[PDB]
Design an enzyme around this catalytic site. Structure first.
Site, PDB file in Angstrom:
ATOM      1  N   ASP F  63       0.969  -1.122  -0.356  1.00 43.00           N
ATOM      2  CA  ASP F  63      -0.159  -0.210   0.319  1.00 43.00           C
ATOM      3  C   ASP F  63       1.005   1.272   0.202  1.00 43.00           C
ATOM      4  OD1 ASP F  63      -2.336   1.388   0.659  1.00 43.00           O
ATOM      5  OD2 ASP F  63      -1.190   1.844   2.729  1.00 43.00           O
ATOM      6  N   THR F  96      -4.681   4.643  -2.835  1.00 40.62           N
ATOM      7  CA  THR F  96      -2.955   5.452  -2.532  1.00 40.62           C
ATOM      8  C   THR F  96      -1.836   5.866  -3.584  1.00 40.62           C
ATOM      9  OG1 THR F  96      -2.840   3.453  -0.632  1.00 40.62           O
ATOM     10  CG2 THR F  96      -3.344   5.170   0.002  1.00 40.62           C
ATOM     11  N   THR F  97      -1.797   4.619  -4.319  1.00 40.71           N
ATOM     12  CA  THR F  97      -0.690   3.774  -5.165  1.00 40.71           C
ATOM     13  C   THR F  97      -0.647   4.683  -6.625  1.00 40.71           C
ATOM     14  OG1 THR F  97      -1.481   2.206  -5.928  1.00 40.71           O
ATOM     15  CG2 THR F  97      -0.176   1.334  -4.023  1.00 40.71           C
ATOM     16  N   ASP F 402      -9.418  -1.023   4.377  1.00 36.57           N
ATOM     17  CA  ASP F 402      -9.113  -0.265   2.995  1.00 36.57           C
ATOM     18  C   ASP F 402     -10.663  -0.706   2.397  1.00 36.57           C
ATOM     19  OD1 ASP F 402      -6.880   1.088   4.021  1.00 36.57           O
ATOM     20  OD2 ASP F 402      -5.970  -0.637   2.719  1.00 36.57           O
TER      21      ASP F 402
HETATM   22  N1  ADP Z   1      -9.056  -7.659 -10.291  1.00 39.05           N
HETATM   23  C1  ADP Z   1      -8.923  -7.084 -10.496  1.00 39.05           C
HETATM   24  N2  ADP Z   1      -9.299  -7.094 -12.065  1.00 39.05           N
HETATM   25  C2  ADP Z   1      -8.840  -5.334 -13.023  1.00 39.05           C
HETATM   26  N3  ADP Z   1      -9.075  -4.610 -13.070  1.00 39.05           N
HETATM   27  C3  ADP Z   1      -8.656  -4.363 -11.005  1.00 39.05           C
HETATM   28  C4  ADP Z   1      -8.958  -5.616 -10.402  1.00 39.05           C
HETATM   29  N4  ADP Z   1      -7.939  -5.008  -9.203  1.00 39.05           N
HETATM   30  C5  ADP Z   1      -7.717  -3.653  -8.813  1.00 39.05           C
HETATM   31  N5  ADP Z   1      -7.257  -3.268 -10.343  1.00 39.05           N
HETATM   32  C6  ADP Z   1      -6.555  -2.278 -10.464  1.00 39.05           C
HETATM   33  O1  ADP Z   1      -5.831  -1.758 -10.890  1.00 39.05           O
HETATM   34  C7  ADP Z   1      -5.614  -0.533 -10.424  1.00 39.05           C
HETATM   35  C8  ADP Z   1      -4.833  -0.272  -9.160  1.00 39.05           C
HETATM   36  O2  ADP Z   1      -5.111  -0.674  -8.109  1.00 39.05           O
HETATM   37  P1  ADP Z   1      -4.516  -1.134  -6.214  1.00 39.05           P
HETATM   38  O3  ADP Z   1      -3.127  -0.150  -6.943  1.00 39.05           O
HETATM   39  O4  ADP Z   1      -4.733  -1.910  -6.004  1.00 39.05           O
HETATM   40  O5  ADP Z   1      -5.304  -0.014  -5.370  1.00 39.05           O
HETATM   41  P2  ADP Z   1      -4.631   0.848  -3.999  1.00 39.05           P
HETATM   42  O6  ADP Z   1      -4.532   2.434  -5.165  1.00 39.05           O
HETATM   43  O7  ADP Z   1      -5.877   1.747  -3.855  1.00 39.05           O
HETATM   44  O8  ADP Z   1      -3.752   0.171  -4.006  1.00 39.05           O
HETATM   45  C9  ADP Z   1      -7.181  -0.441 -10.444  1.00 39.05           C
HETATM   46  O9  ADP Z   1      -7.257   1.115 -11.797  1.00 39.05           O
HETATM   47  C10 ADP Z   1      -8.120  -1.018 -10.175  1.00 39.05           C
HETATM   48  O10 ADP Z   1      -9.286  -0.686 -11.711  1.00 39.05           O
END
Ligand code: ADP
Ligand code: ADP
Ligand code: ADP
Ligand code: MG
Ligand code: MG
Ligand code: MG
Lengths: 518, 192, 48, 191, 155, 536, 200, 100
Positions: F63, F96-97, F402
């Site tokens: 995260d 966040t990322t 989250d």
């Molecule tokens: N199962 C999935 N299938 C397709 N896209 C996904 C899936 N899970 C997450 N994503 C995509 O990955 C991107 C980054 O999410 P992530 O970095 O994991 O969340 P955060 O930034 O809150 O840690 C998001 O824009 C989301 O649309």
């Protein structure tokens, strides 16, 4: 542009995976010799006060040794959870979780598999692995005599790994009786292991009662019969009232002579209320001072002082009575019973022997050995043995060991690898080949062949015999039901789940960030 | 044996000037009447343990005990109280209300001789209803290092007697059973 | 001669091994065997 | 150099009057007004003088917050005692709190049972002495083997209070500096 | 001055001790409030209970925690202080028409401007400037000018 | 200088300065150094990272906020990115990322425009107009879900719950964590489906067991045992009763003493015996008060001595000690009870109600942790998360936190958008279209923001191992061919770039917050000209 | 205006009153309702907890029968101090000094919100917003000195709780919450507004 | 302007008072700019900079006259006599606006 501060070690390249993978291999190879019945004990040299420690369990070893690698902490932490959860199988988790990362290393380097594909195969491979134990288990709850025989064979399996491999035939009866004594209470704190150095290792015993570490105070007798036990937790000695703002406005010392006399009168009145029960023994956790000790002599009541609060719980359950305070109402209160009480001596320290109690909801084990290190190893052996057998009562299902548990998982895991055609099949095969190494190191510790002996176990199970396994005393395949070795379902469920989830940790890591030490 | 001071918190208040003479009379009287009751039981020797939070025997009390010909010995260790009661057959006394003649022991002579600047208080003769008598042996020597080894050399001597009365029988030493057992196992070693 | 100012003569093997501070842990196990021989039997603490 | 400083530094308000005949009035009375002001500050700071037997809720109420005092950083030292009636050293340390409370009225002396102090505290570690000052723990002292153990005396306890900065070294109330009148009487005769 | 500490032997004193301090402080303000005073200059720290009854009738409070700062203010209105908490004497009460609070330098300031009638002494001069160093030298120039006015009195 | 020491600021020789173009290159490369850390972490195919604290403890996190929070840095530009990820973590708790790689994407594209000689204010004003234009377009294209019933509204939470759990570990049991996450909000919710209280649900982890052992329980978690464990561990209710009649007390079992320091003087032996009578009658009156009140289990804040153990044991009354005040806030809301101060105010209306009280071991000797469960819907849910490692259960806490925050965003009405790289590309092509007629001097400014938005799909292309140019070419051509804008980069490989099919949903409020914090920080970093830093 | 690390500057809004951080979690905070239709504000200064009364602590007791009564008297007067606050119908309670767990739980039963640990500068802003007055004594409380507003609602703002007052007919106060990404963003928005507010 | 003092407190601002406040200026003549910034910031709160970039130009413009034989009082008499007309001229530049 160095965004980090001074003395900040960062690894964002292939060396990060190599440093994390080699750390688990170093932790893995450290514990390969400790696995199996022919495994060698290890020696720990402490850095403070030269306090040595001999132990075969990987949890005590890895917690004691210092390791700065972040990958080493995961192997330390997964072993600590396994030691606290079940109390056995910690080295199996350490060597299996390291071998899964060892087998996953060549997929990353040679075959160039994605890390998300290796874990994805381990998810489906672990699912089929636990499903094999669902059908391979057997419930022996319908008969107590067979369950009594199951606790023997589980004690044979757990105690064979420690230094008690010869004396496990005698301690197997000692271990199972303590479990049938507790009749389902899985709390390990209700067993007092009294450490005594000297004598032969087979001189241990299990008396039907509770053995105190202390003796009578001044003049109370050693040998008595038909004693009523009464336990108390309150002060009972120079009673300091609950409010500390109390004072005495003394106008003359002659009146203060009456006040100190009044403190003796209420204490004399309190001991007079103890005599209304008609008892012969009285026990209190606080140390008893001189004045209340003297009044028990005329009443013919025995006195024991300075009992630990954890021992009061064991003392109440062996006696079967109840801890009584506020002695005005003797009707509602309950007290225990005992046939005979006698003071004994085992070595230099005397002890109090209880025998013939009504309740048998707890016990105490008296160990004998030569060195405190041998005694200590014995303490870490019955604790791991009794911990597995204690959880066997709540989890009655068992699984046959001796290489048969790891292979029947691989039989189902290899079957499922064909129905998932693609690149994931290599990951599931890597999970299968990781399970083949547990019977391999078990054969390497005894000095047998690693390839031919495992190959015979491979062919024996696919022919349609799901009871074949390794026999280390002769070096050949034999039946497990005749030899009589078996593990619990919670143990094999725990090590497969712990080793599986432990592999998921250090495969999803690419960068290692090290801040300054404090 | 001390002036009154209970473990509970207390505070003495003097309101009138003439009360100072009264409390000073009652302090010594509190020591006197307790010592007077010792004369009623005709107890001739007293042994006090190590006192905590206050002095064991007050200096004002020693005048009453010294004029009535009573030997006073204080600062005895707590674990030795079981030893004295078991040997002399005297039950301890924690309160004057339980202080009676039947609980006291007996002795023919309690002498404290002067020899080599080291005092010894030894009781001659014990007679009581006791199935567990006691024994005491002093050690003399040049310096403390020889006293310590003379104690441990006697411990190894008593442990041999402890072993014979524990386990019946004995064997002839001097290297005999080592050669005998080596001969016996060597005879059987070639058969196995 | 111990660490503090105390001096002691000793023929007993248990007290010899007890006062000797050994760096090697395996040789230190003989201190406990002599303690075990002293506690159980009380004779022949050096013969073991 | 020190011979001139010993006239004023090594004499209290009661001892400074001895130099009324020898030394100058303006030289002596100037310092007596200074020492008199210091005595008045200690009287205003003497908000205590007996053992504060508190409950667990009040533990914050009287200890940490109190150690802030005026919060002029008017800090106040708070000696806490985790008492336990069974142990031998606890009743010894309780007696020292009562004696020290009557002398050092500016320092707060606090007592509480050890069972009511910390969740399931080890009884072997009792008695425990904690010293708070401005909310911070200055000393987490362990059982009294450091202070002689069972043979602890009032002189050893007063010496510990000087180490933690609770009492000055040259304080006239300390038994080390509070020489007896018979001692000073013999010194004047043999002088 | 010597060991002011509460003492309550029974519950009857516990109930009245809390209300006794309120009624006692209120009773002292009645004799002060009936004289028609609307601002009191304090010499040291004022308690909160005394402040609650002062701002009830709209009496202004002013801090002057020093000796000379309190003496200079009496010369303006011509008042004679008394340390007692009783009734001020009517002859000793001072005369001030208005007490304004406005923003000059961004901070809170209290003004005591008199009028042409009932003139006063020990007046002040509001000296505004940009640099604090220039305020120091101009201030000492007023001291030199005020020192020159002293030269007319003696000869 | 003229020979004299020419000094102005204190510690002249220690601190330095930096200006001109070299000050900018230190800023953009510092963002690229942080962006490389976050770029290989984003997306479902990301990888965790280990942050070693100074105290030896580690945290395995993927995260951006927890990574940047436990990172010891020196450059101030990264320290503003540390706070930007923390800003996204505190309020929304999602992306966040993203707010790091997106802010770096604006910064990387701004480097090329600084080379052309555009003033930074015109660069900053361009992203501000482009950000509001993209938000104004995305607000029109997204659809509302409030028209559907409650049965389908639960499915929309399952769409977002599986989206938030994935990309984190806890992605195996993620189908049950999605149901468990949705089941937590079904119990704790407002009847109008608005402004739910997040503080009612606290996080609680337990080191032990496996992930499969985790389950739902509506109650409180206390890390302590009952007093004097001789009673049975699992107490049951009566045959006919409304409940167990829970009682809570903020008064320890003792005689009543004043809060002020007191001096009780006993000047006579008769008064001393009355103190003994007063000592015993208070404990006798105390146990009779709770007896007549009908309470079975008693909760005490400030503990009690050992005298009350036997009085409570004989009457079949379990009890506890050293219960902190924060837990009593959680006990009163769960069991719907009122905490009485004292026994004189004790009444049967203030006592709580719950189904049953019981305790288990979890292993050998660890600790006895108390468990409470409710028989119906209540205003409190406590997640009972297990884990094989301390780092597993620690990451499962912030991962599930989250997840509840993403569901908390959907409680707000009419905020839903289909992510998966579709939200970035659909906002990118319109900005380039506006630049064709809104050319001006800021024509390249819109092109920079259009290319910066597309980097997140290219980041997903790198982690998934696909060709980036072929991916963005197909998505851009598909968006121009058809105006249906819910097609994105699917990296988990279920086929289909279409997406509503692949049950993925992001909060609309979370997605617009990405470009806002990214643009708002880029406006600040571009203003910096002089960089004065002092030595440590 | 105060600092709120976290959020985006565009989501700010105008407030007709004050919004202050509680800075302490009470035992009975969640039991109180967060939404009052017709709230009434009353500012206090007395310390509502069981402790020493007036800067001293010394109580002599001779008889043990009176030792029970003097403790009940302390419990009697503290509820008498709280009951005078309850009888006037003050829904919001505010005090500079701390408020104990005994008082906040008494207010928590019958739907009475309370808060503490606030500065004097914040308290002076509360009076001019609601138009009430300060009362450091519970006995001299009257109905006329109680302030009122339109509604009350505690909202989640940057992982920090703030008690909002708004909708007054005549408010002297303007206080907006500054939310932003970095701590310098909220600081720059403060200094920019502080410079602009002086000009207008 | 980005400044970080010895205590590692980051700050971003473009105000003549705030920038000179964090910078501990030890030079005696340079603290005159600090005083007028705080004086301008305390009362008006805007244009703090325009006060500083203006005073520096007057002193920078007085540099070559000091290199010449012009005395110090002659330069001060010019600005003090010219600033009186600038204040009166600004009163004419300013408007008496009341409508709207
Ligand atoms: N199962 C999935 N299938 C397709 N896209 C996904 C899936 N899970 C997450 N994503 C995509 O990955 C991107 C980054 O999410 P992530 O970095 O994991 O969340 P955060 O930034 O809150 O840690 C998001 O824009 C989301 O649309
Ligand atoms: N006599 C024996 N015959 C066959 N197999 C044995 C024998 N003794 C031990 N084993 C095998 O060796 C293994 C020992 O595992 P163990 O050392 O208890 O693991 P851990 O120490 O990690 O708990 C068991 O799985 C058991 O099947
Ligand atoms: N008088 C003797 N003559 C010959 N041999 C002896 C004599 N006394 C003892 N021994 C032998 O010497 C050994 C002495 O052992 P010892 O020193 O007593 O052991 P420890 O000191 O450890 O008790 C014995 O084992 C015995 O065989
Ligand atoms: Mg094992
Ligand atoms: Mg996410
Ligand atoms: Mg400006």
């Amino acid at each position: 542009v160095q965004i980090f501060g001074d003395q900040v070690t960062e690894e964002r390249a292939e060396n990060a995976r190599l440093s994390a993978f080699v750390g688990a291999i170093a932790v893995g190879d450290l514990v390969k010799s400790t696995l199996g019945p022919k495994g060698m004990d290890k020696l720990l040299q402490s850095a403070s006060s030269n306090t040595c420690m001999v132990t075969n369990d990987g949890a005590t070893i890895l917690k004691s040794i210092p390791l700065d690698n972040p990958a080493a902490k995961v192997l330390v932490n997964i072993s600590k959870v396994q030691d606290d959860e079940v109390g056995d199988g910690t080295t199996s988790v350490t060597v299996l979780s390291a071998e899964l990362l060892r087998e996953a290393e060549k997929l990353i380097d040679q075959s160039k598999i994605h890390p998300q594909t290796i874990i994805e195969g381990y998810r489906l491979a672990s699912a089929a692995a636990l499903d094999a134990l669902t059908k391979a288990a057997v419930d022996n709850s319908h008969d107590k005599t067979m369950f009594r025989e199951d606790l023997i064979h589980i004690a044979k399996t757990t105690l064979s790994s420690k230094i008690l491999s010869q004396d496990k035939d005698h301690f197997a009866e000692l271990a199972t009786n303590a479990i049938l004594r507790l009749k389902g209470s899985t709390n390990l704190e209700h067993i007092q292991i009294i450490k005594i150095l000297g004598g032969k290792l087979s001189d241990s015993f299990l008396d039907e009662g509770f053995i105190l570490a202390k003796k009578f105070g001044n003049n109370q007798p050693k040998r008595i019969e038909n004693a009523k036990i009464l336990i108390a937790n309150t002060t009972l000695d120079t009673d300091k009232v609950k409010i500390f703002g109390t004072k005495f406005k003394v106008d003359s010392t002659a009146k203060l002579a009456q006040l100190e006399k009044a403190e003796r009168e209420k204490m004399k009145n309190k001991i007079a209320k103890i005599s209304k029960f008609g008892i012969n023994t009285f026990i209190n956790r606080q140390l008893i001072y001189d004045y209340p000790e003297q009044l028990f002599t005329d009443l013919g009541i025995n006195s024991i002082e300075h009992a630990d609060f954890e021992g009061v719980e064991r003392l109440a359950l062996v006696t079967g009575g109840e801890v009584v305070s506020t002695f005005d109402e003797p009707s509602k209160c309950k007290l225990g019973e005992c046939d005979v009480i006698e003071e004994i001596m085992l070595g230099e320290q005397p002890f109090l022997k209880f025998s013939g109690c009504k309740a048998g909801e707890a016990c105490t084990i008296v160990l004998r050995g030569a060195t405190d290190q041998t005694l200590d190893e014995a303490e870490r052996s019955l604790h791991d043995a009794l911990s597995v057998l204690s959880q066997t009562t709540k989890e009655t299902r068992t699984v046959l060991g001796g290489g048969c548990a790891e292979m029947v998982m691989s039989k189902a895991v290899d079957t499922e690898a064909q129905n998932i055609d693609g690149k994931k099949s290599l990951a599931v095969e890597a999970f299968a080949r990781a399970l083949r190494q547990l019977p391999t190191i078990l054969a390497d510790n005894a000095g047998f062949d690693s390839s031919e002996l495992v190959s015979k176990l491979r062919s024996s199970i696919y022919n349609g015999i799901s009871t074949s396994g390794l026999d280390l005393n002769n070096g050949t395949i034999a039946d497990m039901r005749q030899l009589g070795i078996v593990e619990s379902y919670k143990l094999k469920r725990a090590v497969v789940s712990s080793a599986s989830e432990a592999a998921e940790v250090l495969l999803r890591v690419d960068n290692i960030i090290r801040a300054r030490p404090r | 044996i001390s002036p009154p001071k209970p473990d509970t918190e207390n505070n003495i208040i003097v309101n009138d000037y003439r009360q100072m003479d009264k409390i000073l009379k009652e302090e010594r009287a509190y020591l006197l009447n307790i010592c007077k009751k010792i004369k009623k039981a005709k107890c001739n020797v007293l042994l006090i343990q190590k006192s905590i939070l206050r002095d064991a025997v007050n200096d004002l009390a020693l005048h009453f005990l010294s004029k009535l010909n009573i030997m006073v010995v204080k600062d005895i260790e707590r674990e030795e109280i079981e030893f004295l009661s078991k040997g002399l057959g005297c039950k301890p006394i924690a309160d004057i209300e339980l202080f009676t003649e039947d609980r006291l022991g007996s002795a023919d002579l309690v002498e404290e001789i002067d020899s080599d600047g080291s005092k010894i208080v030894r009781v001659t003769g014990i007679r009581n209803n006791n199935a567990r008598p006691t024994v005491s042996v002093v050690i003399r020597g040049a310096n403390n290092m020889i006293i310590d080894e003379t104690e441990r050399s006697l411990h190894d001597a008593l442990c041999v007697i402890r072993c014979l009365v524990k386990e019946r029988g004995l064997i002839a030493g001097g290297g005999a059973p080592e050669i005998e057992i080596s001969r016996r196992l060597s005879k059987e070693a070639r058969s196995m | 001669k111990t660490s503090r100012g105390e001096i002691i003569i000793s023929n007993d093997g248990h007290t010899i091994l007890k006062q000797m501070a050994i760096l090697h842990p395996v040789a230190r196990m003989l201190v406990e065997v002599s303690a075990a021989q002293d506690s159980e039997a009380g004779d022949g603490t050096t013969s073991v | 150099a020190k011979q001139h400083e010993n006239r004023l530094e090594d004499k209290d308000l009661s001892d400074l009057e001895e130099l009324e005949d020898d030394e100058d009035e303006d030289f002596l009375e100037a310092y007596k007004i200074k020492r008199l002001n210091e005595i008045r500050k200690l009287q205003e700071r003497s908000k205590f003088g007996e053992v504060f037997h508190i409950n667990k809720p009040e533990y914050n109420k009287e200890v940490t917050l109190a150690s802030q005092g005026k919060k002029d950083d008017g800090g106040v030292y708070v000696f806490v005692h985790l008492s336990l009636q069974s142990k031998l050293q606890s009743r010894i340390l309780s007696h020292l709190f009562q004696s020290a409370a009557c002398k050092f009225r500016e320092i707060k002396f606090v007592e509480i049972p050890a069972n009511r102090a910390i969740e399931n505290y080890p009884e072997s570690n009792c008695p425990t002495l904690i010293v708070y000052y401005r909310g911070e723990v200055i000393k987490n002292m362990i059982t009294l083997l450091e202070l002689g153990g069972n043979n602890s005396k009032m002189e050893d306890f007063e010496d510990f209070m000087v180490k933690v900065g609770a009492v000055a070294e040259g304080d006239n109330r300390l038994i080390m500096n509070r020489d007896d009148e018979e001692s000073r009487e013999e010194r004047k005769l043999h002088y | 001055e010597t060991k002011g500490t509460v003492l309550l032997h029974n519950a009857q004193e516990m109930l009245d001790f809390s209300k006794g301090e309120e009624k006692q402080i209120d009773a002292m303000m009645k004799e002060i409030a009936d004289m028609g005073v609307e601002c009191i200059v304090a010499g040291a720290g004022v308690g909160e209970l005394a402040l609650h009854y002062l701002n009830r009738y709209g009496i202004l409070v002013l801090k002057v925690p020093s000796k000379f700062e309190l003496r200079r203010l009496c010369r303006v209105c011509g008042a004679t202080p008394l340390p007692r908490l009783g009734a001020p004497t009517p002859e000793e009460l001072g005369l001030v028409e208005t007490v304004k609070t406005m923003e000059i330098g961004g901070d809170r300031v209290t003004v005591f401007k008199q009028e042409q009638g009932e003139i006063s002494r020990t007046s002040t001069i509001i000296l505004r400037g940009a640099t604090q160093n220039n305020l120091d030298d101009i201030e000492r120039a007023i001291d030199d000018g005020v020192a020159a006015v002293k030269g007319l009195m003696k000869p | 200088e003229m020979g004299r020491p020419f000094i102005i600021v204190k510690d002249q020789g220690n601190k330095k300065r930096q200006h001109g173009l070299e000050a900018k290159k230190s800023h953009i490369l510092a963002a690229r150094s942080v962006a490389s850390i976050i770029k290989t972490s984003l997306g479902p195919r990301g990888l965790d990272k280990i942050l070693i604290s100074p105290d030896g403890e580690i945290t395995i996190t993927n995260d951006g906020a927890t990574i940047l929070s436990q990172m010891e840095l020196d450059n101030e530009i990264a320290k503003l990115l540390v706070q930007l990820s923390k800003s996204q973590d505190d309020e929304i708790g999602d992306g966040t990322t993203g707010v790091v790689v997106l802010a770096s994407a604006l910064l990387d594209q701004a480097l090329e425009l600084i080379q052309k000689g555009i003033h930074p204010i015109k660069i900053a004003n361009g992203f501000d107009e482009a950000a509001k234009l993209a938000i104004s377009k995305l607000e029109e294209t997204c659809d509302d879900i409030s028209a559907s019933n409650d049965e389908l509204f639960r499915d929309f939470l399952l769409r977002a719950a599986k989206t938030s759990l994935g990309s984190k570990i806890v992605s195996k049991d993620h189908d049950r964590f999605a149901e468990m996450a949705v089941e937590a909000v079904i119990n704790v919710m407002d009847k109008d489906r608005k402004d739910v209280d997040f503080d009612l649900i606290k996080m609680q982890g337990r080191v032990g067991g496996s992930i499969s052992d985790s389950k739902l329980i509506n109650g409180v978690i206390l890390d302590k045992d009952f007093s004097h464990p001789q009673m049975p561990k699992c107490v049951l209710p009566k045959e006919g009763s409304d409940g167990v009649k829970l009682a809570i007390l903020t008064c320890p079992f003792e005689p009543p003493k004043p809060k002020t320091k007191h001096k009780l003087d006993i000047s006579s032996v008769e008064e001393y015996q009355k103190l003994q009578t007063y000592e015993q009658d208070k404990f006798k009156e105390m146990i009779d008060d709770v007896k007549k009140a009908g309470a079975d289990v008693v909760i005490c804040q400030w503990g009690f001595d050992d005298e009350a153990n036997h009085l409570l044991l004989q009457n079949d009354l379990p009890a506890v000690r050293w219960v902190g005040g924060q837990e009593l806030e959680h006990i009163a809301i769960s069991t719907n009870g009122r905490i009485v101060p004292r026994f004189q105010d004790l009444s049967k209306d203030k006592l709580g109600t719950c189904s049953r009280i019981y305790e288990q071991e979890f292993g050998t000797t660890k600790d006895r942790m108390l468990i409470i469960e409710q028989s119906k819907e209540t205003k409190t849910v406590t997640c009972f998360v297990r884990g094989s490692n301390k780092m597993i259960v620690d990451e499962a806490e912030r991962a599930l936190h989250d997840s509840l925050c993403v569901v908390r965003n959907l409680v707000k009405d009419s905020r839903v958008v289909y992510g998966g790289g579709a939200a970035e590309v659909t906002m990118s092509l319109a900005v380039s279209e506006e630049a064709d007629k809104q050319r001006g001097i800021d024509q390249y400014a819109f092109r920079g923001f259009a290319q910066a938005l597309d980097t997140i799909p290219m980041t997903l292309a790198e982690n998934s191992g696909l060709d980036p140019i072929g991916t963005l070419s197909t998505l851009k051509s598909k968006q121009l061919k058809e105006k249906i804008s819910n097609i994105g980069v699917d990296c988990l490989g279920y086929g289909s770039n279409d997406m509503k099919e692949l049950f993925v949903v992001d909060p609309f409020i979370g997605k617009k917050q990405q470009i806002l914090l990214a643009t708002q920080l880029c406006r600040m970093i571009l203003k910096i000209d002089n960089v004065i830093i002092s030595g440590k | 205006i105060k600092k709120i690390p976290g959020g985006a500057m565009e989501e700010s809004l105008f407030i007709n009153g004050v919004a202050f951080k509680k800075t302490f979690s009470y035992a009975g905070f969640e039991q109180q309702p967060k939404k009052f239709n017709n709230p009434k504000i009353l500012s206090l200064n007395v310390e509502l907890e069981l402790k020493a009364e007036k800067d001293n602590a010394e109580v002599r007791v001779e008889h043990v029968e009176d030792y029970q009564a003097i403790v009940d008297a302390e419990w009697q007067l503290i509820f008498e101090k709280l009951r005078q606050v309850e009888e006037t119908g003050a829904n919001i309670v505010l005090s500079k000094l701390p408020i104990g767990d005994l008082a906040t739980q008494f207010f928590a039963d019958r739907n009475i919100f309370c808060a503490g640990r606030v500065s004097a500068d914040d308290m002076n802003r509360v009076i001019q917003a609601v138009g009430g007055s300060i009362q450091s004594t519970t006995s001299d409380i009257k109905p006329e000195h109680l302030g009122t507003c339109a509604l009350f609602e505690e909202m989640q703002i940057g992982s920090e709780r703030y008690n909002l007052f708004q909708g007054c007919p005549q408010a002297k106060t303007c206080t907006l919450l500054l939310r932003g990404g970095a701590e310098q963003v909220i600081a720059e928005v403060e200094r920019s507004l502080h410079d602009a507010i002086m000009i207008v | 302007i980005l400044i970080v003092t010895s205590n590692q407190k980051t700050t971003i601002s473009n105000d003549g008072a705030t920038i000179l406040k964090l910078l501990d200026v030890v030079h005696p003549a340079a603290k005159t700019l600090v005083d007028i910034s705080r004086a301008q910031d305390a009362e008006v709160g805007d244009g703090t900079t325009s006060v500083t970039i203006l005073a520096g130009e007057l002193m920078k413009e007085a540099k070559p006259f000091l290199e010449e034989g012009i005395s110090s009082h002659l330069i001060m008499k010019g600005y003090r006599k010219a600033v009186s007309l600038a204040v009166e001229k600004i009163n004419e530049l300013a408007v008496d606006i009341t409508s709207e």
